[model samples]
Target: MDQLKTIKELINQGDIENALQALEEFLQTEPVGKDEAYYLMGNAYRKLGDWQKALNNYQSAIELNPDSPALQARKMVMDILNFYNKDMYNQLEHHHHHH
Candidate 1:
C-alpha cells in the first residue's frame, strides 16, 4: 500500500526503472539521508549503470544501519571502486613481485 513497500516489491520484481520513479516520489515527501531510502537508491543506481552513485548511497546506508546484512552491497561497491579507481601499476607490480 505504501510507496516504500511498493518500491521494495518493484526491486524484487526486477522493475528497477519504475522502482526508481517511485523512489523519487517517496523522496520528495520524505527526508533525505534515510537508511532505507539510501539502500533502495543504491540498488536503483546499480541497475541504472551508475555504480559510483550506488557506492556512495550504499556507504551511507551502511553507516546508518551498520548491523544490516549489506555484505553483497559492500562487495559490489568495493569491486567497482577497485576496478575503476585502483592503480593498475600497483597491481602489476604486486603480481610481478609475487613470482
Candidate 2:
C-alpha cells in the first residue's frame, strides 16, 4: 500500500473521512510534502460538499507546485459552481479523479 494506491482506494470505496485523515497525517509527518496530498485533500473536501475548503486546498496545492494537476480540478469545480445553476451540479459529491 503505497500512498497513491491507498488514497485512491479509499476514495473509490466512499471512505473520504479516513482518506482526509490519511492526507492530514501525511502532511504533518512527511519530511517532503507532496502536491498530490493537498490536491487529494481538496477532493476529499469537495466530496464533503465544502466548496470553500476545497478551493482553498486546491489553491494551496498549486502554490506549493505550480504544475500540480489540482489546478484543473479547482477550475472545473469553480466553473461548475459559478457558471451553472447550483441545482444542476448540486451533487458535488459525485466521483472525480485525480492522478
Candidate 1 stretches with Cα past 4 Å from truth are: 12-18, 24-33, 84-99
Per-residue lDDT of candidate 1, residues 45-81 (tens digit): 8877786678777777788778644447856766765
What's the lDDT for all of these models? 0.69, 0.77
lDDT of 2 by residue, 21-98 (tens): 888888887655657888888888888788778888898899898899989989867875766455534465344322
* Winner by TM-score: 2
Candidate 1 global lDDT: 0.69
Candidate 2: stretches off by over 4 Å: 84-99
- TM for candidate 1 is 0.58
